JSON list of C-alpha atoms and ligand atoms in Angstrom, two decimals:
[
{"chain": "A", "resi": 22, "resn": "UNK", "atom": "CA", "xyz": [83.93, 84.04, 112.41]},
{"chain": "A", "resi": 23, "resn": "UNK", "atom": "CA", "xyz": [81.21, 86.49, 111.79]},
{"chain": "A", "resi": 24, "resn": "UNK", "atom": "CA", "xyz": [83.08, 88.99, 113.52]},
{"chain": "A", "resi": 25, "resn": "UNK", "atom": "CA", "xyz": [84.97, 91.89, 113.52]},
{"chain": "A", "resi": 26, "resn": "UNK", "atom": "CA", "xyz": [88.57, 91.93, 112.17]},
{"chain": "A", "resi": 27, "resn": "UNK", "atom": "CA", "xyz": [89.74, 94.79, 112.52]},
{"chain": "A", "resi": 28, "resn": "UNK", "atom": "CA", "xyz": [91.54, 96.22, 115.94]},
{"chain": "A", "resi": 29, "resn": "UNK", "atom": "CA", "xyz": [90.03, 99.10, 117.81]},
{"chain": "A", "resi": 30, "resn": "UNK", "atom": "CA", "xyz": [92.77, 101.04, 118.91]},
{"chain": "A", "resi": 31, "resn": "UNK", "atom": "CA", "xyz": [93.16, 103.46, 121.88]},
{"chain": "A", "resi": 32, "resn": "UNK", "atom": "CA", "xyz": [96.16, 106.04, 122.88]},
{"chain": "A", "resi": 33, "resn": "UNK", "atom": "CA", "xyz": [96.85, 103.57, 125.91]},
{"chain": "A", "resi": 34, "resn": "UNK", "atom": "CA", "xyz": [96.66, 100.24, 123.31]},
{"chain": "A", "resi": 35, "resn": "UNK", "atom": "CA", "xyz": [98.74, 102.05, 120.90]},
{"chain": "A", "resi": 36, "resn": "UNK", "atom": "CA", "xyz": [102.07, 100.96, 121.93]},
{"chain": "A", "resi": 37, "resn": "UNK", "atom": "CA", "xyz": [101.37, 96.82, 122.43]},
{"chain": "A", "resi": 38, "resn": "UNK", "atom": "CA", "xyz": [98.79, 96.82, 120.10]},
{"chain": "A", "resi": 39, "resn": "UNK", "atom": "CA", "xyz": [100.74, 98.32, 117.12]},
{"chain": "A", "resi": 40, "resn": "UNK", "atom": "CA", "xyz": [104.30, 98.43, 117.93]},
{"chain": "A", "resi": 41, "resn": "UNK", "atom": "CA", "xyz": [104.75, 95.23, 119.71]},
{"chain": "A", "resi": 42, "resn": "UNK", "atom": "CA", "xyz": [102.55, 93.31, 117.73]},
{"chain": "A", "resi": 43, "resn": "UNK", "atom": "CA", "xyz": [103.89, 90.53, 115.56]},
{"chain": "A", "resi": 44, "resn": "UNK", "atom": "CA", "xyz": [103.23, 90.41, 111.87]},
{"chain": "A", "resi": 45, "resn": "UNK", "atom": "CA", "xyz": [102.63, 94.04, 109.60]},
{"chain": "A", "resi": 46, "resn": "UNK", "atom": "CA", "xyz": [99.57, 95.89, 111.08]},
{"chain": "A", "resi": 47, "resn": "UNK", "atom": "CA", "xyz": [98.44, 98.37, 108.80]},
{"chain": "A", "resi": 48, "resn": "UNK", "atom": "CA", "xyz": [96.85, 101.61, 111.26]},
{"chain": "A", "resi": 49, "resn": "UNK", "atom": "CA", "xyz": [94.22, 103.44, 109.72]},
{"chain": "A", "resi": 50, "resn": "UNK", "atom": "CA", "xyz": [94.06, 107.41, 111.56]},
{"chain": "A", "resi": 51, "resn": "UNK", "atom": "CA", "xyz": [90.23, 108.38, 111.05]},
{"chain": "A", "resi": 52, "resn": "UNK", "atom": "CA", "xyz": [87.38, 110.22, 112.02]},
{"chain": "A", "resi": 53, "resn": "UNK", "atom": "CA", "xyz": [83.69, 109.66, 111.62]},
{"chain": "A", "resi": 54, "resn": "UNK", "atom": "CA", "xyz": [82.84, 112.72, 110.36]},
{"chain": "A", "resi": 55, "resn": "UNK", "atom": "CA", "xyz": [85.49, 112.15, 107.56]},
{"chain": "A", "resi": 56, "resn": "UNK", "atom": "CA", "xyz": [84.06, 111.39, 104.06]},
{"chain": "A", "resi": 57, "resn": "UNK", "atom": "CA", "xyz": [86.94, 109.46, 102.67]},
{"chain": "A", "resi": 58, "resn": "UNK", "atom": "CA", "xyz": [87.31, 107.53, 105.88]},
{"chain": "A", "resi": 59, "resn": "UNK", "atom": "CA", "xyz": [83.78, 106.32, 105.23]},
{"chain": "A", "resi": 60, "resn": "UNK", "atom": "CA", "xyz": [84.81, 105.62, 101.54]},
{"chain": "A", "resi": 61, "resn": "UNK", "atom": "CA", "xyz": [87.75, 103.54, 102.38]},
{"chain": "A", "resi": 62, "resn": "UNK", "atom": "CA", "xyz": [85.68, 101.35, 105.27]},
{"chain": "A", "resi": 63, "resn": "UNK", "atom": "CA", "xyz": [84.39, 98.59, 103.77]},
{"chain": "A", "resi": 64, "resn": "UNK", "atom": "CA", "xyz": [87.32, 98.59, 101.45]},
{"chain": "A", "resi": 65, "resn": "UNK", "atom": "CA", "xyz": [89.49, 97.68, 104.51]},
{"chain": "A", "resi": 66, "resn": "UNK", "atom": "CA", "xyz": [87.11, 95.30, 105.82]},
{"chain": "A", "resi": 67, "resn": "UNK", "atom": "CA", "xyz": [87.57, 93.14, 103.05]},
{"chain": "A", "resi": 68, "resn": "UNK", "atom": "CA", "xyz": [91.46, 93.54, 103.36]},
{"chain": "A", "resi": 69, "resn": "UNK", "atom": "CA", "xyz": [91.31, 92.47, 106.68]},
{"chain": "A", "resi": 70, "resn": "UNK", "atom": "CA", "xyz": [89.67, 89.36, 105.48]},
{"chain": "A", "resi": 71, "resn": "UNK", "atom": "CA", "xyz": [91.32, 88.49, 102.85]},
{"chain": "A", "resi": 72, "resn": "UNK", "atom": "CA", "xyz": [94.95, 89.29, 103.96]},
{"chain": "A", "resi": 73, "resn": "UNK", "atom": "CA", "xyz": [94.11, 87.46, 107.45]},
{"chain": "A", "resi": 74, "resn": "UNK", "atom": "CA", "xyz": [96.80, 86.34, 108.94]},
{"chain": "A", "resi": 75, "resn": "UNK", "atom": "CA", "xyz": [99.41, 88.43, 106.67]},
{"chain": "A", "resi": 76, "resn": "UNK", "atom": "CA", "xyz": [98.27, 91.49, 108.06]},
{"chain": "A", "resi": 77, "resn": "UNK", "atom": "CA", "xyz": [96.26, 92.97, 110.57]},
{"chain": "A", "resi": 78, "resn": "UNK", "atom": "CA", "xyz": [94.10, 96.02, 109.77]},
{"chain": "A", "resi": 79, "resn": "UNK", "atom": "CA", "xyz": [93.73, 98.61, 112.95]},
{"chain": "A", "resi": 80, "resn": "UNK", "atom": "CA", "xyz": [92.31, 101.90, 113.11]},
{"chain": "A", "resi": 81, "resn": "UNK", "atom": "CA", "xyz": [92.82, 104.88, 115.66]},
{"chain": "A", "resi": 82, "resn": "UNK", "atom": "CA", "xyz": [89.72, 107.57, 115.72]},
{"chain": "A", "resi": 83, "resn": "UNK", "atom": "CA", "xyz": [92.39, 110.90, 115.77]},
{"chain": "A", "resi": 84, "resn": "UNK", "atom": "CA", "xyz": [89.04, 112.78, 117.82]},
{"chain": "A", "resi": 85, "resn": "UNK", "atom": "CA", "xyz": [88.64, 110.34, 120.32]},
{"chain": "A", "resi": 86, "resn": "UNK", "atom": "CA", "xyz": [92.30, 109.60, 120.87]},
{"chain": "A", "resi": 87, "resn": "UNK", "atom": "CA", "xyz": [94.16, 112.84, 120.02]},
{"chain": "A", "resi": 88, "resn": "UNK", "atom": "CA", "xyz": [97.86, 112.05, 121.35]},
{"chain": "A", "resi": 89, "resn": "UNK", "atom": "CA", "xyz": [98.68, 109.33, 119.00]},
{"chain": "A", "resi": 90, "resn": "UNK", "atom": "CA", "xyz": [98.99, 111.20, 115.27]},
{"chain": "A", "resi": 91, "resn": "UNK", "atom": "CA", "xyz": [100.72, 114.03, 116.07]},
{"chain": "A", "resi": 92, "resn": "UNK", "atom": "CA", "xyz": [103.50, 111.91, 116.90]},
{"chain": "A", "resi": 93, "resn": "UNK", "atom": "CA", "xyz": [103.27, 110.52, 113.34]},
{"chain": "A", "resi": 94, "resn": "UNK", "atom": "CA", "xyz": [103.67, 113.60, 111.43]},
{"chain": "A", "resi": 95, "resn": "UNK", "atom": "CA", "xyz": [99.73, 112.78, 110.50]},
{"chain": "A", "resi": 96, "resn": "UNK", "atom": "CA", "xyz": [97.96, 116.01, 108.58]},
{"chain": "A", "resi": 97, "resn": "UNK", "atom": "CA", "xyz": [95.25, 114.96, 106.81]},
{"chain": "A", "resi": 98, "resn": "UNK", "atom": "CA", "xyz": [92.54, 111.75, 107.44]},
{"chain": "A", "resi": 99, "resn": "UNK", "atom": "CA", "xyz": [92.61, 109.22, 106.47]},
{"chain": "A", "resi": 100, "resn": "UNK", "atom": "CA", "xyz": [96.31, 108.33, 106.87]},
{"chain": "A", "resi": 101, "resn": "UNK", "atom": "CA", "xyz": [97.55, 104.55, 106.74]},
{"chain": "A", "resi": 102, "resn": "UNK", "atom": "CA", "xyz": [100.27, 103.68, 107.95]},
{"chain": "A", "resi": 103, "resn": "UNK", "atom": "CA", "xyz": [102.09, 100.12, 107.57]},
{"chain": "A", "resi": 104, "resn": "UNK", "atom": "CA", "xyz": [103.93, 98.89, 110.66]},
{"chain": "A", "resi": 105, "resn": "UNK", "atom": "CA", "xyz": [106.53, 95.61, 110.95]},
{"chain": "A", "resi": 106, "resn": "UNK", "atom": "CA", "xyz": [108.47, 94.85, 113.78]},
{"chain": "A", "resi": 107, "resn": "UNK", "atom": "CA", "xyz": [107.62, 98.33, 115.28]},
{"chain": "A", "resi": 108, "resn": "UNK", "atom": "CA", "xyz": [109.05, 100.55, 112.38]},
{"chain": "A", "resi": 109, "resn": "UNK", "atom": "CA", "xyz": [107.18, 101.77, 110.22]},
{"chain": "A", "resi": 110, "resn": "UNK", "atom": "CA", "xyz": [107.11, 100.36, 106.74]},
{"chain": "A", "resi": 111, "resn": "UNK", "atom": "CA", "xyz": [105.24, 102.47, 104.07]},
{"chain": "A", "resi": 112, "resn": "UNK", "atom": "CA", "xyz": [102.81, 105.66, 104.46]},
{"chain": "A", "resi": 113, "resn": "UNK", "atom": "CA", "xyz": [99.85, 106.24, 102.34]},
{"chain": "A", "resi": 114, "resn": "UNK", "atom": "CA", "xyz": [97.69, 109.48, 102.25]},
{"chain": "A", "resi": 115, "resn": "UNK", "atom": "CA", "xyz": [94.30, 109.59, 101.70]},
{"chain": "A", "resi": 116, "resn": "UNK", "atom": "CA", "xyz": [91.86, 107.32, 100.27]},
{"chain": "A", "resi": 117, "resn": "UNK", "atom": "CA", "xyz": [92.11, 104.90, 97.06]},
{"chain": "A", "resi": 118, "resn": "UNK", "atom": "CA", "xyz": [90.65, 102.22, 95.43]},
{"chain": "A", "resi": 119, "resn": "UNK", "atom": "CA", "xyz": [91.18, 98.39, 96.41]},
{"chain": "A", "resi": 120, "resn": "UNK", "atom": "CA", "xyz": [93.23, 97.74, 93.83]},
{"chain": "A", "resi": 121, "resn": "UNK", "atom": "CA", "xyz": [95.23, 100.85, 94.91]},
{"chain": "A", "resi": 122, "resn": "UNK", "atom": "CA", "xyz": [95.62, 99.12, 98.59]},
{"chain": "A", "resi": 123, "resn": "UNK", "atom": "CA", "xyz": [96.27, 95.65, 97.29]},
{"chain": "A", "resi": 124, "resn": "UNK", "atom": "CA", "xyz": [99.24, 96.84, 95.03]},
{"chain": "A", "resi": 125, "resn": "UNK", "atom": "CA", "xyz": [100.46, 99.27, 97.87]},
{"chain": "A", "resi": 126, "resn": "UNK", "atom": "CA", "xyz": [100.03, 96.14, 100.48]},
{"chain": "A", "resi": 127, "resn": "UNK", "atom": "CA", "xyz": [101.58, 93.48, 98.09]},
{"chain": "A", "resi": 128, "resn": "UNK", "atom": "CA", "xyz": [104.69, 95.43, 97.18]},
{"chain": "A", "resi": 129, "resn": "UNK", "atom": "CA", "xyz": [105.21, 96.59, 101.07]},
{"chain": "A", "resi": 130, "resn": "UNK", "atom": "CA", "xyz": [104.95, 93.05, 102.62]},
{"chain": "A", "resi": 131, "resn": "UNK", "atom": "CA", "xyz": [106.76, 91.17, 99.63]},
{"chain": "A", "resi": 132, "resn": "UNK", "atom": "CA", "xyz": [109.99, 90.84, 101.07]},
{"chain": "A", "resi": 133, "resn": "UNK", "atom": "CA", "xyz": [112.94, 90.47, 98.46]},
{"chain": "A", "resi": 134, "resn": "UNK", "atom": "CA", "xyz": [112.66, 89.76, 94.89]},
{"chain": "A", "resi": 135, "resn": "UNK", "atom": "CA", "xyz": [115.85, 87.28, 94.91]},
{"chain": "A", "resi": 136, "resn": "UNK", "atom": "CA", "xyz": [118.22, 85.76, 97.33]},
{"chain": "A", "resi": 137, "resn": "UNK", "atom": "CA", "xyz": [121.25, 87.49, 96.43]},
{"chain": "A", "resi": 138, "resn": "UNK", "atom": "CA", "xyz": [124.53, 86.28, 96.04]},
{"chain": "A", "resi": 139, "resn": "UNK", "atom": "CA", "xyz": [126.23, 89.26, 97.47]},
{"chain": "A", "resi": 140, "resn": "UNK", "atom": "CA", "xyz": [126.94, 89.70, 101.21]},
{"chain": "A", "resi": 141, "resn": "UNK", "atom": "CA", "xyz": [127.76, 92.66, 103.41]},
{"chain": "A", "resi": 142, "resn": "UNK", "atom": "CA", "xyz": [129.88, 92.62, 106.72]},
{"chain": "A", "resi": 143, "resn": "UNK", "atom": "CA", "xyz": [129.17, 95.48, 108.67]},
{"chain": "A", "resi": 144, "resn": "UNK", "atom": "CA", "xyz": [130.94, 96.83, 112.28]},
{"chain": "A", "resi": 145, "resn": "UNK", "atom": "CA", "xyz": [133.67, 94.65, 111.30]},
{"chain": "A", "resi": 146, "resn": "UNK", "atom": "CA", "xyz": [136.89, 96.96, 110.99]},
{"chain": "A", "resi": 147, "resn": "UNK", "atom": "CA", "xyz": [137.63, 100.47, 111.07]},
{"chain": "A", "resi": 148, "resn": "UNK", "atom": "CA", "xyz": [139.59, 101.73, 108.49]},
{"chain": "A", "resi": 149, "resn": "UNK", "atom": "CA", "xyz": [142.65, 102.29, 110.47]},
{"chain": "A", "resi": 150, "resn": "UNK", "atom": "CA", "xyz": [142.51, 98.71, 110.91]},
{"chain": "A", "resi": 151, "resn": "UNK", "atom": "CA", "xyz": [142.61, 97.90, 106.93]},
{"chain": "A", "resi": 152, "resn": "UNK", "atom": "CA", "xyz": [145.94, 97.00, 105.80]},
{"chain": "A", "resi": 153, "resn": "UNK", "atom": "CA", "xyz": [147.15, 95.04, 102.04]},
{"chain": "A", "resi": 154, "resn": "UNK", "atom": "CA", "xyz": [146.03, 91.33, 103.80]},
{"chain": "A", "resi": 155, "resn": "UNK", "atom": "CA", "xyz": [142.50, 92.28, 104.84]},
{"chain": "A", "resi": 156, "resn": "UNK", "atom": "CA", "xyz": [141.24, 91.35, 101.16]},
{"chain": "A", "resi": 157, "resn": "UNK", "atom": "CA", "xyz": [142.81, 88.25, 101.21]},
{"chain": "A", "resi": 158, "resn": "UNK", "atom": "CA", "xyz": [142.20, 87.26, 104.94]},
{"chain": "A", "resi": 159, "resn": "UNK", "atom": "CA", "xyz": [138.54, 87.70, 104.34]},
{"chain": "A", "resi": 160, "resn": "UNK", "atom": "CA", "xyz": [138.36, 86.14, 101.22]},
{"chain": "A", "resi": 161, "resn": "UNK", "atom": "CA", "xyz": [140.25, 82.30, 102.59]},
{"chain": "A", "resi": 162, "resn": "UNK", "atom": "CA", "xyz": [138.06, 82.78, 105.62]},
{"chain": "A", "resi": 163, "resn": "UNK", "atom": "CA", "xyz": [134.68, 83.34, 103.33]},
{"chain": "A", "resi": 164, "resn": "UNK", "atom": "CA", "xyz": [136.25, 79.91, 101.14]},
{"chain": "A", "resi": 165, "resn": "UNK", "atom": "CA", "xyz": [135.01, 77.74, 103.89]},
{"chain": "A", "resi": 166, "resn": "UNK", "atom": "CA", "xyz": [131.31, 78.69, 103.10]},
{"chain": "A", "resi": 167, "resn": "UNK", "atom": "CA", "xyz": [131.81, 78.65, 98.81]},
{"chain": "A", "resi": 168, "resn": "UNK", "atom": "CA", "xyz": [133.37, 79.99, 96.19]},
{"chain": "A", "resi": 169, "resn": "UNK", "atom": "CA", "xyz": [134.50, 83.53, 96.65]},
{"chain": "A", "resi": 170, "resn": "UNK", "atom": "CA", "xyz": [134.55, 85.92, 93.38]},
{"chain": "A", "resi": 171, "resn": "UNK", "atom": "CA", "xyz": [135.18, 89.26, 94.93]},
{"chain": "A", "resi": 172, "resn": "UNK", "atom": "CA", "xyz": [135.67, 90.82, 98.20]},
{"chain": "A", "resi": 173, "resn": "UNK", "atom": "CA", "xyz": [135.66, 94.30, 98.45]},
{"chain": "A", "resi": 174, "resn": "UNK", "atom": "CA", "xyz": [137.05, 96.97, 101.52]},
{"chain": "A", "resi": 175, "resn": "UNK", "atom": "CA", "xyz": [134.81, 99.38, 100.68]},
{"chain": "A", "resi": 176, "resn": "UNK", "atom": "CA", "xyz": [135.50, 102.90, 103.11]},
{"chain": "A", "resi": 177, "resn": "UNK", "atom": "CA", "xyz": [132.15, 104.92, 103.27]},
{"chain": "A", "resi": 178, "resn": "UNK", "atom": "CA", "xyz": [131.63, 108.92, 104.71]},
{"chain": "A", "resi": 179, "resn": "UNK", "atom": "CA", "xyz": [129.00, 109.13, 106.69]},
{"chain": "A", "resi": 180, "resn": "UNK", "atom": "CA", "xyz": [128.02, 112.91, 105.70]},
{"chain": "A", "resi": 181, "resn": "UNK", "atom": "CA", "xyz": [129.13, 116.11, 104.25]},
{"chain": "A", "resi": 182, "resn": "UNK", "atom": "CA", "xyz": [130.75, 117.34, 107.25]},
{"chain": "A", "resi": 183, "resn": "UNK", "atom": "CA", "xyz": [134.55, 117.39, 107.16]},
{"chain": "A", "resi": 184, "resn": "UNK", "atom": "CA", "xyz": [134.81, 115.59, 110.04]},
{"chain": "A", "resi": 185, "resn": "UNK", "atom": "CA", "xyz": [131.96, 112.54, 109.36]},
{"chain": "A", "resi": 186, "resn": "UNK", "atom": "CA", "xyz": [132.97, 109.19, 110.36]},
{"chain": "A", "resi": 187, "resn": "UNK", "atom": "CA", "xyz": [133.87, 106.65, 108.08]},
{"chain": "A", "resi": 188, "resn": "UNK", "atom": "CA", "xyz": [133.32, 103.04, 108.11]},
{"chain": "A", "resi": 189, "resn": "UNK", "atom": "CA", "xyz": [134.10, 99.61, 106.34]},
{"chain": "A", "resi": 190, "resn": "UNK", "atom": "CA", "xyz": [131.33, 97.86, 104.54]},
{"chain": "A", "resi": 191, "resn": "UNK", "atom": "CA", "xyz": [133.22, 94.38, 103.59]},
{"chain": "A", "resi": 192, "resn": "UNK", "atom": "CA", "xyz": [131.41, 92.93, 100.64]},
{"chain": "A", "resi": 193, "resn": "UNK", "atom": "CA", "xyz": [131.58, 89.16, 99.69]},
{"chain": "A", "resi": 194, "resn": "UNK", "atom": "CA", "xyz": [130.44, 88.50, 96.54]},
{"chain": "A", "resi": 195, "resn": "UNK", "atom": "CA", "xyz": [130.26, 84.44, 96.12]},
{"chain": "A", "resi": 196, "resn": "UNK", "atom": "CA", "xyz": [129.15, 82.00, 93.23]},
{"chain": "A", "resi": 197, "resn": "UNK", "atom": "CA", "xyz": [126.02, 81.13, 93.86]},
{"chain": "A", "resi": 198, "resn": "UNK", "atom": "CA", "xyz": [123.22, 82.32, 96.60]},
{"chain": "A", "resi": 199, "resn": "UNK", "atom": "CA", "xyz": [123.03, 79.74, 98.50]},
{"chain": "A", "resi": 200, "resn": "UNK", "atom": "CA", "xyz": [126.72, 79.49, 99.35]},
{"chain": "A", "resi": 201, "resn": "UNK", "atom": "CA", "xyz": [125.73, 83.19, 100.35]},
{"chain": "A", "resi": 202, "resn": "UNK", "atom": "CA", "xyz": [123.19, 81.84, 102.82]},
{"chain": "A", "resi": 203, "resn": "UNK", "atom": "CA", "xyz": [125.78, 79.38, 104.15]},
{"chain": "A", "resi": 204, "resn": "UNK", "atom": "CA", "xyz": [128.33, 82.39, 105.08]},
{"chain": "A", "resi": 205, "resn": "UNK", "atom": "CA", "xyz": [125.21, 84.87, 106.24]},
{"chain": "A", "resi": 206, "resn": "UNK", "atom": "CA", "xyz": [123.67, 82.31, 109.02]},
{"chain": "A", "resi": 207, "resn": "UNK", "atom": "CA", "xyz": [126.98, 81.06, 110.17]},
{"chain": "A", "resi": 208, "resn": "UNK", "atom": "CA", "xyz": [128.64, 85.19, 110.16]},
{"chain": "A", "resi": 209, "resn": "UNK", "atom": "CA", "xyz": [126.08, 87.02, 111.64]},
{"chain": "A", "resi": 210, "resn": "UNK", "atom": "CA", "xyz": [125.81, 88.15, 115.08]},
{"chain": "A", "resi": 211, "resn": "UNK", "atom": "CA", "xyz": [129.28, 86.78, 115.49]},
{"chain": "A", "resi": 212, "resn": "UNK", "atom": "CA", "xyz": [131.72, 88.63, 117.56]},
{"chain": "A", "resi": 213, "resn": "UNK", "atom": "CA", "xyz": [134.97, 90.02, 115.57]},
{"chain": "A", "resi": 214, "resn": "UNK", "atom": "CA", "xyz": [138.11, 91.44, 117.56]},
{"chain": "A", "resi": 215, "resn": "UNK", "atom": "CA", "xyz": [135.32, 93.35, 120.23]},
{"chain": "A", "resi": 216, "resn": "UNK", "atom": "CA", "xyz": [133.00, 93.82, 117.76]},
{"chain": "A", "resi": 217, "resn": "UNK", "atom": "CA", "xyz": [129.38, 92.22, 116.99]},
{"chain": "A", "resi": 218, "resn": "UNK", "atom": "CA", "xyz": [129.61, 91.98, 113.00]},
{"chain": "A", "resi": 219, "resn": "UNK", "atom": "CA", "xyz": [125.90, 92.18, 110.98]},
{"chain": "A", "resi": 220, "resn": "UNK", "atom": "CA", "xyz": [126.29, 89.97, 107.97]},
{"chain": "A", "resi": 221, "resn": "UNK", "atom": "CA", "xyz": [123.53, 90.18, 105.44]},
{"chain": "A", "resi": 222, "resn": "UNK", "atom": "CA", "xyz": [122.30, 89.97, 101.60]},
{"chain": "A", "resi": 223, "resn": "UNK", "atom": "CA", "xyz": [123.50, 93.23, 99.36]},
{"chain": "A", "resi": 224, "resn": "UNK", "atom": "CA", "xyz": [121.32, 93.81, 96.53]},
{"chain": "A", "resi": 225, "resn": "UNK", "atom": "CA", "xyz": [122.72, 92.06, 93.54]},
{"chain": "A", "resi": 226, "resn": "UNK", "atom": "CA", "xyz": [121.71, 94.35, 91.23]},
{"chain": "A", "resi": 227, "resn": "UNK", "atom": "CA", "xyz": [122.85, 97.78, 93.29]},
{"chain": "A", "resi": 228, "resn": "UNK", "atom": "CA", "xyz": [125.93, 95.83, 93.60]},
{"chain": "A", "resi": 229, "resn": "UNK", "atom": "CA", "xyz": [126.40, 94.48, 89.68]},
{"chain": "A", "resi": 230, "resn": "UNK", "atom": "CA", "xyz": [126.00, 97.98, 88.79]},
{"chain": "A", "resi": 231, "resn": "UNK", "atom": "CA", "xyz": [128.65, 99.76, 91.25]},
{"chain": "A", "resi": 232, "resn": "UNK", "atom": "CA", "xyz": [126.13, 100.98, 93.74]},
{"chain": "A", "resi": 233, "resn": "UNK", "atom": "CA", "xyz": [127.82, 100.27, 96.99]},
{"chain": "A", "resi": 234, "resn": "UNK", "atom": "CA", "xyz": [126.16, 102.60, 99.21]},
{"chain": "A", "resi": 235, "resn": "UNK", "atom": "CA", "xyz": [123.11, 100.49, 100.47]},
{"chain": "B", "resi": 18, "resn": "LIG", "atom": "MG1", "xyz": [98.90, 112.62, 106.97]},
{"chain": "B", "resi": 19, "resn": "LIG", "atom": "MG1", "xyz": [98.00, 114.43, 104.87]}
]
């Protein structure tokens, strides 16, 4: 309508407004003494109308509601920050032009470039658990979904202490992507010897190059 888009937010709203809220809500920390804040107003006026229903534009006056930015980390105004699901996406300090926002908007609520053909099984064994057949175990089981060309048992430390954990990142590395998709929808969530495995894409690319530590 002729009306306004974007939400007026509150310390008490905060919460179900912003982190409960479904689809990316980008929050805009202001004040109305604040010279870029003015700058940047219209500019996220006509966001809010023309990325309506993609994202939701809010904004949180830090004077009138003081509790909220601290608990950001905010320092200077304004401060937008781009929320999905309740964690937060992409930060972006002070003010910019439109085309600025629209790049900064379009590559934070893209999503993935490519449905890879690489997947990851995580929780799925510890290493004390990995013996010589574990390779080819996973890689007959993963031949119901496709063609398998690699499986890796990949051991990761989790930190520079001597004492870090380690875990097993399992990658399956099929044919083509959507033999991938087959394996991810049917794997994940599934329960594995106690444990509730997370099966997911792996970034071809990191992966093509070596990079297993995504
Ligand atoms: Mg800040
Ligand atoms: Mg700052």
């Amino acid at each position: 309508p002729m009306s306004d888009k974007i939400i007026h937010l509150t310390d008490d709203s905060f919460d179900t407004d912003v982190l409960k809220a479904d689809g990316a809500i980008l929050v805009d920390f202001w004040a109305e003494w604040c010279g870029p804040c003015k700058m940047i107003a219209p500019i996220l006026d006509e966001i809010a109308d023309e990325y309506q229903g993609k994202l939701t534009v809010a904004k949180l006056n830090i004077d009138q509601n003081p509790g909220t930015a601290p608990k950001y980390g905010i320092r200077g105004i304004p401060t937008l920050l781009l929320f999905k699901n309740g964690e937060v996406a992409a930060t972006k300090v002070g003010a910019l032009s439109k085309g600025q926002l629209k790049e900064f908007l379009d590559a934070n609520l893209a999503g993935s470039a490519m449905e890879s053909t690489v997947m990851v099984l995580r929780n799925m064994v510890d290493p004390k658990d990995i013996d010589d057949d574990l390779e080819g175990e996973v890689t007959e089981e993963c031949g119901k979904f496709g063609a398998v060309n690699r499986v890796i048992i990949y051991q990761e430390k989790q930190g520079e202490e001597e004492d870090a954990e380690i875990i097993v990142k399992i990658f399956v590395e099929f044919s083509i992507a959507s033999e991938t998709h087959k394996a991810i929808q049917a794997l994940n969530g599934r329960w594995f010897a106690g444990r509730k495995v997370v099966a997911e894409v792996y970034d071809q690319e990191r992966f093509d190059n070596s990079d297993l530590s995504a």
